[PDB]
Fold Acetylcholinesterase.
Amino acid sequence: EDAELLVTVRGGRLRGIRLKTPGGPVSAFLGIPFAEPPMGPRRFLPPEPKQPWSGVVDATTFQSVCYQYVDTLYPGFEGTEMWNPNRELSEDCLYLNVWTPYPRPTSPTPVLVWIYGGGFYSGASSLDVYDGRFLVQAERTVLVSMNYRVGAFGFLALPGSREAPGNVGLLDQRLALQWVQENVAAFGGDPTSVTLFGESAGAASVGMHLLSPPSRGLFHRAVLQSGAPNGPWATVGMGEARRRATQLAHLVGCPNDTELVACLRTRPAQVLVNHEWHVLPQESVFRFSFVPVVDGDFLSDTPEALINAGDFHGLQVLVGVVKDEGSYFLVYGAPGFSKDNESLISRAEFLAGVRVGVPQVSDLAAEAVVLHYTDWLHPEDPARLREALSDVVGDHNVVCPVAQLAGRLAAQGARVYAYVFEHRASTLSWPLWMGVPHGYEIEFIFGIPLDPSRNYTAEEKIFAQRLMRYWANFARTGDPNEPPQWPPYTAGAQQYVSLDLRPLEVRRGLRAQACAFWNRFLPKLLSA
Amino acid sequence: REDAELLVTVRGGRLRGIRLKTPGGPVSAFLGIPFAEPPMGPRRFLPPEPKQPWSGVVDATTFQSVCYQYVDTLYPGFEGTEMWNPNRELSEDCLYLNVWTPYPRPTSPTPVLVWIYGGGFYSGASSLDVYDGRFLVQAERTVLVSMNYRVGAFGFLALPGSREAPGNVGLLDQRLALQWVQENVAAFGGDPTSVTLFGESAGAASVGMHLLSPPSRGLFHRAVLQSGAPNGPWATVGMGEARRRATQLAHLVGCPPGGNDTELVACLRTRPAQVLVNHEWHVLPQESVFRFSFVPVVDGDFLSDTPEALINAGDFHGLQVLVGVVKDEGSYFLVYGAPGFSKDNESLISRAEFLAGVRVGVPQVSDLAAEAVVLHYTDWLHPEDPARLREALSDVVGDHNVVCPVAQLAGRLAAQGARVYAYVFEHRASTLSWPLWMGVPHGYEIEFIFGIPLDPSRNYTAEEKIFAQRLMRYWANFARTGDPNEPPQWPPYTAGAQQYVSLDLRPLEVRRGLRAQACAFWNRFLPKLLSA
Ligand SMILES: *[C@@H]1O[C@H](CO[C@@H]2O[C@@H](C)[C@@H](O)[C@@H](O)[C@@H]2O)[C@@H](O[C@@H]2O[C@H](CO)[C@@H](O)[C@H](O)[C@H]2NC(C)=O)[C@H](O)[C@H]1NC(C)=O
Ligand SMILES: *[C@@H]1O[C@H](CO[C@@H]2O[C@@H](C)[C@@H](O)[C@@H](O)[C@@H]2O)[C@@H](O[C@@H]2O[C@H](CO)[C@@H](O)[C@H](O)[C@H]2NC(C)=O)[C@H](O)[C@H]1NC(C)=O
Ligand SMILES: *[C@@H]1O[C@H](CO[C@@H]2O[C@@H](C)[C@@H](O)[C@@H](O)[C@@H]2O)[C@@H](O[C@@H]2O[C@H](CO)[C@@H](O)[C@H](O)[C@H]2NC(C)=O)[C@H](O)[C@H]1NC(C)=O
Ligand SMILES: *[C@@H]1O[C@H](CO)[C@@H](O)[C@H](O)[C@H]1NC(C)=O
């Protein structure tokens, strides 16, 4: 036996596995139970701590993926299958993973905690693109990632009810963060230096832990990649959450809240998944059925309101976006779009796409979108319309929520660093018209290009090593700079850097003109 | 001993004119021809009546009186403002017109240009030096006509429905002059079947209203709209708001001691003309720039609908129009009420003064609408740069009142059968007395259209004289042919390509879009916003 792979947690003993990287070995502890399995009567309920076990838990392989919808838009296509579950689905899915250097560190080592995205309806810590071995070897951190419940299992809410209070998937995350505080030192990690990082709904999750006091004591720094808690998709009101939960029950043959949840608990998990998309109020892209609910407990107010009221002195945040946030989502419902065409849409398709990408707004609000995003010297140019609808979806859902979060946090005491990721991977299987699509900086942050079995260029590996150094520099010090400098983002100067194969370039404004529309004017329009 | 060239018989009787010297040769001028009975006493606020025939010879030898009007006092003695102020005595006896013709008189019928001055429907006169028609007639051998029309309350006070102050009588003054041209211009050598209206600011709005009023449209064949359009937010008023303004004016001068309309106007008619002028600005609903108290009223008679609706519903096949704007339409107006502005300094305003100026420049709109304006005209990478803010507020006022109304009319006329030519005038005269930050201000293309640089007593450069001769040729070519191009080309403006040309000392340059991004806000979105 190898003593470096034997660890005792508070719940008992674990057996890890030695992993190889091109830079040397890494210790991995995969599939550590941190909660009791949320099954049967535990479905929809907050997680409970895993009870202690005798013997040695096998922690040499990833555990099951939480039950979720499986994308079937392009079967067998690398660009979609890389996000699909790579382990069997199960409601017994509340496990987390710890990578550490080999041999295990003997001094407290900074901890990175990864929260995956997936629109709160999908995702897994076991995805190849989230493999922590390269970050841990290159930058000598401890990396933790957890599975959390998604879809109805994590976020179905009948607000005020106790059988389905909502946001339990966020409580799964919080329980994992409490687990890190209590046990990460046994792996060499420093519980006093925990940096949360996450992408899309993972970034939204990070922001929500920033705005929920019970979570704030469990970490010290935050990274939000291509997502924010204050967008139009990451939260839902109590009334609409109840309507969606009630329609799902009807769609699966179920009838007060007590009897409703009891009937839902009798249904196979896959039956809930098969009706998940049909509780949305309209055809759309970038909207998900079961998301965090604002009900006064986990979030005592809207994320917007909590961001505006917060004192954020002493917090450092790293936030950013990819160059083309909107393009990926257009093939999931915007008319005229496909990954196998040029998607050169007409004005009619553009106008129809605006209602799909900006759903549930008045005709006047939609007219305002069309005004801002039309070039009135080229109102019908297909290439310009394609780019414009990509901008609509990306600005509305990602760029402008991130810009507002960054500006408000900076103006209220936080040190913010902002980036735009502008390198299209040579490996990218999506068509050229999508540019740098949503999600495709993750493989570089995790050092995946260092994997020899993959086909990245020599320059891309150096680029990955640069990004891993920025991220780990930020985790260690709150400052990504290697001591061309990366300046903090401020509400006035609005400075950010471009991340690509070229050295850092400092620019001003995260789509400032467009985001003034989404963040300043449009909310006034919807009030009246 | 008389000169046969200076004697003309019109339908009302005989006239005697004068021979005008010009740098290029002699011109015949008949200045101060009565075309209506004097609208005095009981005739105040009433539609004009045709001038009754006279015996003997009327001396049409000098400009007649300016119609009674407010006199600008913002910068006393400043050439930039005094050039627009009355240069004849003020009088309600002011319905006279002017005819310039070549010397000797043309033998074959000659195209006619008819000028309608601007001045916000509250001021102006055909006698202003800058409207001297002698150079156009000499250079391009056309007949030039200009008329005085009543302004202010005398021309546009309206108690809608009443026959004692029906409104729009200043427009009826213009139409009667136009009827006079149809009936009499051939006696001067002019061709009544080739008449081109042209005007600037309120004169341009007037031209457009004659295009949209069937009884006027039969009296001309082509139109030129300089820096103005009938569909602007300042050029017309609704029936109720016109009544409110008339009733408030009467109240401020002691009438009645609202109520009965006949009683009210009878009391108004006893008030001295200057007393009404002294309270004219007090009836506006708020502090503003580019808003005028008494303007054409949309009451179903002269205008059967709003100019917007008439433009959208009209068939304009067989019409040629020439339209355009100056480069900085808004700047002149900011010193008349926008906080922080003055011709004397650089008017580098603050953000707070910019936001306050938006409400002055876009008066009587909801807070939401004002927010939309601020959104579109703020550079959110430089939201507080004083120079950018000054320029932005100029664009706000200029796009809202001139550029975008002109662009809407140009686009709809073109799409509905008219041949349209569009320009942007971008030469700042060497003699301009306004400060440099104002750029090319509203109204300062006129002197080049009328060829004023050819006047020996003024100091224009030689290139500006050549420029002035170029523009006169464009305008006269359009008057003769419907196309400013001489028999680099000036392409027609269409709703798609939206091409226009730049007028300056360099040869014509073709460009696209009359501030298309901005005017989409004003012409397409903002009306939708004001509807809920
Ligand atoms: C680009 O493709 C889209 C989507 O079409 C799908 O993908 C291709 C395999 C193609 O062969 C289509 O049959 C597929 O439906 C096209 O938009 C579709 O057009 C069809 C036929 O008119 C219509 O039934 C679908 O509803 C449309 N789908 C969407 C999402 O709009 C689009 O026309 C193609 N672009 C081209 C050819 O330029
Ligand atoms: C509104 O007022 C006019 C005012 O005319 C009055 O005529 C006399 C009756 C006298 O009161 C004068 O001082 C006024 O000037 C009315 O029009 C008059 O009506 C009278 C009688 O009906 C008739 O001879 C004429 O129509 C008008 N006389 C004039 C002009 O001398 C009008 O009827 C009033 N309307 C209402 C509803 O009261
Ligand atoms: C630019 O001038 C404006 C306009 O008014 C000036 O006031 C005179 C006293 C004189 O200074 C001239 O240059 C101008 O005619 C200034 O704004 C004025 O400021 C004064 C004093 O605070 C105030 O009483 C007026 O109400 C202001 N007028 C307006 C229209 O707001 C402005 O301050 C000047 N800009 C500078 C000095 O940078
Ligand atoms: C033209 O020049 C002379 C001075 O040389 C003088 O008349 C004046 O300054 C200028 N302009 C006018 C209108 O007189």
